[PDB]
Amino acid sequence: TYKYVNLREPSMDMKSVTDRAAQTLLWTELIRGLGMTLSYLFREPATINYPFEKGPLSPRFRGEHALRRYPSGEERCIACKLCEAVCPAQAITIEAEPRADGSRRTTRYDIDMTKCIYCGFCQEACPVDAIVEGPNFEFSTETHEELLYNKEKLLNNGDKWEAEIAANIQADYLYR
Amino acid sequence: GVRTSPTGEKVTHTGQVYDDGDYRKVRFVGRQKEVNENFAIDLIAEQPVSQVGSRVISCDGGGGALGHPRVYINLDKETKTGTCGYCGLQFRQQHH
Amino acid sequence: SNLIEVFVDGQSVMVEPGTTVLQACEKVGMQIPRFCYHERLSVAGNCRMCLVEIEKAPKVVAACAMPVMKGWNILTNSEKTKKAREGVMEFLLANHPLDCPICDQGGECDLQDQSMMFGSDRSRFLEGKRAVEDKNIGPLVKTIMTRCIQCTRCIRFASEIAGVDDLGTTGRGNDMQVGTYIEKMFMSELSGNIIDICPVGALTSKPYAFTARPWETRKTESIDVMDAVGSNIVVSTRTGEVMRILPRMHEDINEEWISDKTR
Amino acid sequence: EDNKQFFGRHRWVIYTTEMNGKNTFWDVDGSMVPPEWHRWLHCMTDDP
Amino acid sequence: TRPTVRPRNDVAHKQLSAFGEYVAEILPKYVQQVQVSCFNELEICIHPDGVIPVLTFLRDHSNAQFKSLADLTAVDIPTRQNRFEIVYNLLSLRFNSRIRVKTYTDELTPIESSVPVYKAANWYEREIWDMFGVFFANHPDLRRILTDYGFEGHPFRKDFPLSGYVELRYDDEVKRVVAEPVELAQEFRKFDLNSPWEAFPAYRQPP
Amino acid sequence: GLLKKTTGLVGLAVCETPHERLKILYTKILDVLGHIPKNAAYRKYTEQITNEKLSMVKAEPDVKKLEERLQGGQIEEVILQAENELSLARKMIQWKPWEPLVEEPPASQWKWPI
Amino acid sequence: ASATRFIQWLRNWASGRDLQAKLQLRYQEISKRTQPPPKLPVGPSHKLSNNYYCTRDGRREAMPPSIVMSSQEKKAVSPAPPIKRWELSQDEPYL
Amino acid sequence: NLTLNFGPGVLRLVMELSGEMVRKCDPHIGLLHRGTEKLIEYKTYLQALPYFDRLDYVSMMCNEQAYSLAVEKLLNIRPPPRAQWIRVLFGEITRLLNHIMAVTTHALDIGAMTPFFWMFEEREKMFEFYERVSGARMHAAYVRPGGVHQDLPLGLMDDIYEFSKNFSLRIDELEEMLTNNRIWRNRTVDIGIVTAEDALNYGFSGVMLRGSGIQWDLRKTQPYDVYDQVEFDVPIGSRGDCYDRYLCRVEEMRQSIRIISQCLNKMPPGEIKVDDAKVSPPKRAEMKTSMESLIHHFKLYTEGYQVPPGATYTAIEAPKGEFGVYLVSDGSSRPYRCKIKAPGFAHLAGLDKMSKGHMLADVVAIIGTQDIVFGEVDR
Amino acid sequence: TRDTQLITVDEKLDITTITGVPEEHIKTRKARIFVPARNNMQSGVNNTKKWKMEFDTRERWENPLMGWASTADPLSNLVLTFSTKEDAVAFAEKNGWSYDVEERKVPKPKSKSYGANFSWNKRTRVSTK
Amino acid sequence: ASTSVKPIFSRDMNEAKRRVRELYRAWYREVPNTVHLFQLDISVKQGRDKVREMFKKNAHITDPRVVDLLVIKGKMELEETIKVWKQRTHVMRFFHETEAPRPKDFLSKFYVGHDP
Ligand SMILES: CCCCCCCCCCCCCCCCCC(=O)OC[C@H](COP(=O)([O-])OCC[N+](C)(C)C)OC(=O)CCCCCCCCCCCCCCCCC
Ligand code: SF4
Ligand code: SF4
Ligand code: SF4
Ligand code: SF4
Ligand code: FES
Ligand SMILES: [K+]
Ligand SMILES: [Zn+2]
């Protein structure tokens, strides 16, 4: 099924020809366009008062990265390198070795936040919910070096955003 | 835990610290070295061993689907404690 | 002259007497699934992953061990063959631990890759799994024996190639365990080769533990210089570092084994 | 909060005039909102 | 029917097979192979001399009316003598069908430009020359389209390194952007992902 | 009946005598196909479909009812396709695409996967 | 929604429409940002019997292309029947 | 004549002007060529998915859909019915996102700035639908071979209904500013006229074909997903100029609301990705309890699923025209070749023809009416 | 049968000048044409079917900032696949590269007999199953 | 049979050499315009030396098809320069004014690193 957008024959009776002459001479349809912008002047603007107000987000938002812990304080990551294999941008670099107690843990865990495309595949791939993308989106830096995160930065983000990262995972894990 | 080498520089939980004559220490002049003060190797050692009454126990890290894959830990050996390969919680059998 | 004609999916192939169904399929480029069969160890026929249908035969035969008879038509892709593999793979994964992320074999596991290609895509095992005690057989081979699939490759290698009858099966039924029974170190000059033949993460390399995943290593084919045998090796590197040394096949020099010093 | 305001303006934060030793009377910043309130202020939840 | 398997359209598979023979009979001088895939796509493989005849026939014939060139691209297969493979995707609006026409060339053999048949092939052939180095004879205006001016090589060839041979940089001594040999602070890590177990026996090749 | 005011397609003018133009073009096509060898598949097929369309032009004087038979869109689109068919027939004589295959491809030219 | 009645009339007149019925600013008529937990269903393959993968393996049913003509009287045909002519919409034929 | 260098997506026009008239227009592209098609050869099929969000970065989920349809075709698997309805739902929301950008930035370029701000307050509300399903405002990567990543969050369909209940009024406000405006008409009427036969021979698609009366739309001639279970009308132009194409896009926005009203009422229950763990990853609650599910999660995210060898050309009716990928598989986990057919690549190549006998200021109108984004032209 | 004029060129195909490769990476590189060895950790043989062409490994050093693995070799990740050995040598010769070719190593056939495990008078008898 | 190959423009080296000289004349006449138009700091002598060096690199070719491609690419390169599609940076990429001289002898290469 199709419809025509601009297939019309204007009427040629003197009533209609004089209407179009009035529009041409009296600028009637241009003034009608001024009435549409006059109405907006008297509406409430959609602007929010950032930074005192913030735009709404959801529990699924993908922001700054963070490495999480178990409730005991043990790191969740067991250096399986699934996030490093799936990362479409190759932004994750991992080195691991047995820990002093024999556990499988990382010695290097860097995310180049300038290669990362903030896609979330790393948290989908992770089998222990170690690497997540948190809700923070306000971490712009003054240098390129501050955006090459290492394991210490990522563990500091996790200890900094656990209160809010845990709540978001609680509100979305049933959809995963 | 967090310790400082004989130059004032903190040592990370991986054991990393610049030698006394490493030029790479200049990056911390006027700035700081980021170290996490919550060493996980120490914290996991503070967890008491769980006393269970069966040969085989299962661990999912707590939280069901929010934990880690469910593994089963054998407890026959009475000289050591069965440790979880994912989360580090230790388990022992009830005196038999 | 003395060759006999058999068929693989209808294609004719000429094979010598005593050739197995598994070896007949190789000649046409078909590799039957396997866990317990190794071409350099004796035949065992216990994993049952090589079951294949023979046309007109009600009962599936073990390809690794069944000699091929004249005129047989081997159906390597029939529904009966495909159901046989899914059934065996289902049993093989029933008691297996969910250790793939923490298992050093992940990414190069013959149990993972034959589950993706020949097994089913989901589980219907609602019971509790079986866990077993870990043996300590030395400073080279790390044993996490909950992952063992009772294939007996290590038993046959330690006995027939290394000439050390220190590994065996203790127990019976679902409690059958592979090990030394007593606390004994498996220290032979060829001991490290049980890491390779073991298809699962039960036997892994202790020096290499947790250091890399197979997909990220670059493979450089080189020659061992630790002795005068000139064994062919593969040097696994990653980001400019040497991660491990694996044997490289050479029928005339070292086959697929290397000594512990080389490894 | 003021639930008669249109969505997006119904929650706001009046920042503190001092935080961690920094004078924030004029120099407020969006990163001064702690995580517990960061979830409520961005409407990721209805529970303060 | 299985909920997870793509359903088969046998009616359209028979129509496309019949038209493939139709084209194979009307133009025997060029057609080398005709085939229809399990998802109902028809490929006509031709000798490169038959580009203008075959394409004009498909555009103008009354039972073809393939009046739209959906796409024109190339594939590099280094193991063939004629590594490059020129693929023409055509759309018929009269018969609501699509046909694919494939030919071949190498580094030094040119392929007759199809701008006379489909005017859309102008830029599509500038991109094949720019990215693969195939030369098209009698092209009205052939030159690089996507790559940088003075760029050396053909990036989409299989033997061209992913990161190239030169990288740009601003140098304050000469007060201009310069080009220097490529150095990477982190090398592109190479992953060997292929499994050593065969996946699709239906496509197995004879030994 | 009543001549259409427009064809809907831009640049495709209305033809006031569709039947006359079609018989001229189909007859021209059949004349040109006479120069192609009889064994040629292009001649046998092109004549078969050309006659069917010509046999339908000399069976229905109603333009609106002729379109429903030809199933080629508006009658101005049929004429344009007839012109394209004629232009191809003249071009096929020069090409002669009924001769044997010029050259078979290399051994593995069309083998995929490699 | 806080506009006085005079301003509502002025904006409604200038735009020639009743804007108060369709506001571009969202109010309480939006979903609550905290929702009850879901319980999502499972697909047709979640069964404990009659569910062998070889009977629902889509990838293994794909075949290599069929060669209808390889170099190594009969009625003419087209790629498919000619496309059926479209009909005008009875909802709104002309805009 | 006079040769000028206009430009600083980012484009470079090398125009030859005889006073006020354009004699030849010579677009220079590649200012945003990034080697997407070569990079995809080093990625798995899942890793290549985010690359399609970034080709036409105004119609993100339609690019994802075309790639998924191509991979699903080579896999020989079928997404479940609910996933298809979701894809059509967000395919039509994505059409609104693109048409707002196309119409309003087109108007902004020719001096009409106000409608851009009105309709970008509706895009900001449609970006909230993207963010609530995927977590990213623009590059969702939500549509994947096999279906969609996650199911809709509870309450999202009520908010889609509230939005669509008011969007018709917003289009009327747009039309009150442009459709009958004599200044807007003088900038678009009889500008860039393309004949039907030239449109086909130059490889045009979408409103470029339909603005000139050609009755073609892949959603109706070659339907995909569940587009054959929705009722909508295809707008058709008569003059073939910029003004007729402008009306086609504005009417298509109204028909998207018509389709969206049906995807909300006809949404079925069920799963949202193919129940085949060898293609789509298992649920996280079963990857942590079943051995088979853990092996398949491990392999799908490290190696990826192998696609049977073959080559397909799959196309969809993207908002900008026919968008398609010629995807070649060698039987491994990584595509051997992925040519991306961007509709704006053929349209831009026709700028030289469409600009014959027009003023320099009509080139801006012509480029706007082709709806060109140089992420997909350059790739 | 081709109605197009052809010519005769008796010289070996050499495209080194029309490929854009810097001369450093044509003359000083050593291509290696080989069939990859089976990964010894697995029994599958599907990665030992096609010929490969890799180049000589060069220096990888440590990035001073992060410790990453830097490289100045543009060909470090280049791997080409060929159906036959001749196709591989043909491609290296016309690009001017110097190559070493290693012949395929197929595992020789073996005599497997399950009955030998229970021999009456031979050492093939196995002490366990 | 085997050596029968379709040509591009030339049928033998004599025809190909004609195109090479024509291209050389076109480049030689153009260098003064490029130096003035792009405000390059090189001299016309340096520019014409660079053209000669580029031509002499490909003086060992004896395949007419390879020569035709070299001329076809050269003509495109000249077009980008005459029409000022190139910028001052692209023209100055033939001179490598910022790359430090790489060592040529064995001892110099032995000290710096491992590359031969
Ligand atoms: C018995 C007594 C007899 C006395 C004489 C009677 C006189 C009768 C009336 C005379 C005719 C009326 C003339 C009106 C002016 C003509 C305008 C015109 O030419 O239109 C055609 C022109 C051209 O129209 P066109 O583009 O359609 O082209 C017409 C001609 N063709 C089609 C052939 C090309 O239109 C315009 O003027 C464009 C207007 C652009 C301005 C946009 C801003 C408008 C915003 C409104 C501002 C309101 C201003 C108020 C200022 C107040 C200040 C205090
Ligand atoms: S979000 Fe995507 S690109 Fe970023 S680190 Fe995770 S997987 Fe890599
Ligand atoms: S973050 Fe998760 S996926 Fe990545 S290595 Fe650690 S456990 Fe594995
Ligand atoms: S042996 Fe294989 S299947 Fe078992 S846990 Fe290790 S990688 Fe996974
Ligand atoms: S340890 Fe390994 S090789 Fe030995 S029986 Fe178990 S699975 Fe087989
Ligand atoms: S391989 Fe035959 S039973 Fe194990
Ligand atoms: K092992
Ligand atoms: Zn645990």
Curated annotation (Swiss-Prot), chain A:
[4Fe-4S] cluster 1 binds at residues 77, 80, 83, 126. [4Fe-4S] cluster 2 binds at residues 87, 116, 119, 122. It is found in: Mitochondrion inner membrane. One of its GO terms (cellular component) is mitochondrial inner membrane. Binds 2 [4Fe-4S] clusters per subunit. It is a peripheral membrane protein. Its EC number is 7.1.1.2. It catalyses: a ubiquinone + NADH + 5 H(+)(in) = a ubiquinol + NAD(+) + 4 H(+)(out). Disulfide bonds: none annotated. One of its GO terms (molecular function) is 4 iron, 4 sulfur cluster binding. Its cofactor is [4Fe-4S] cluster. One of its GO terms (biological process) is mitochondrial respiratory chain complex I assembly. Core subunit of the mitochondrial membrane respiratory chain NADH dehydrogenase (Complex I) which catalyzes electron transfer from NADH through the respiratory chain, using ubiquinone as an electron acceptor. Essential for the catalytic activity and assembly of complex I. Belongs to the complex I 23 kDa subunit family. Core subunit of respiratory chain NADH dehydrogenase (Complex I) which is composed of 45 different subunits. This is a component of the iron-sulfur (IP) fragment of the enzyme. Interacts with RAB5IF. This is NADH dehydrogenase [ubiquinone] iron-sulfur protein 8, mitochondrial. It comes from Bos taurus (Bovine). The gene is NDUFS8.
From Swiss-Prot, chain D:
It comes from Bos taurus. Disulfide bonds: none annotated. Accessory subunit of the mitochondrial membrane respiratory chain NADH dehydrogenase (Complex I), that is believed not to be involved in catalysis. Complex I functions in the transfer of electrons from NADH to the respiratory chain. The immediate electron acceptor for the enzyme is believed to be ubiquinone. The keyword Protein transport does not apply. It comes from the Eukaryota. Keywords: Acetylation, Electron transport, Membrane, Mitochondrion, Mitochondrion inner membrane, Respiratory chain, Transport. Complex I is composed of 45 different subunits. Belongs to the complex I NDUFA12 subunit family. It is found in: Mitochondrion inner membrane. This is NADH dehydrogenase [ubiquinone] 1 alpha subcomplex subunit 12. GO terms for cellular component: mitochondrial inner membrane; mitochondrion; respiratory chain complex I.
From Swiss-Prot, chain I:
It is a peripheral membrane protein. Residues 103-129 are annotated as: Disordered. Its main location: mitochondrion. GO terms for cellular component: mitochondrial inner membrane; mitochondrion; respiratory chain complex I. Keywords: Electron transport, Membrane, Mitochondrion, Mitochondrion inner membrane, Phosphoprotein, Respiratory chain, Transit peptide, Transport. Belongs to the complex I NDUFS4 subunit family. Mammalian complex I is composed of 45 different subunits. This is a component of the iron-sulfur (IP) fragment of the enzyme. Interacts with BCAP31 and TOMM40; the interaction mediates its translocation to the mitochondria; the interaction with BCAP31 is direct. This is NADH dehydrogenase [ubiquinone] iron-sulfur protein 4, mitochondrial. It comes from Bos taurus (Bovine). The gene is NDUFS4. The chain holds residues 47 to 175 of 175 of the full protein.
Swiss-Prot record, chain J:
GO terms for cellular component: mitochondrial inner membrane; mitochondrion; respiratory chain complex I. It is a peripheral membrane protein. Belongs to the complex I LYR family. It is found in: Mitochondrion inner membrane. InterPro entries: Complex1_LYR_NDUFA6_LYRM6 (IPR045299), NADH_Ub_cplx-1_asu_su-6 (IPR016488). Mammalian complex I is composed of 45 different subunits. Accessory subunit of the mitochondrial membrane respiratory chain NADH dehydrogenase (Complex I), that is believed to be not involved in catalysis. Required for proper complex I assembly. Complex I functions in the transfer of electrons from NADH to the respiratory chain. The immediate electron acceptor for the enzyme is believed to be ubiquinone. This is NADH dehydrogenase [ubiquinone] 1 alpha subcomplex subunit 6. It comes from the Eukaryota. Signal peptide: none annotated. It comes from Bos taurus. Keywords: Acetylation, Electron transport, Membrane, Mitochondrion, Mitochondrion inner membrane, Respiratory chain, Transport. One of its GO terms (biological process) is mitochondrial respiratory chain complex I assembly.
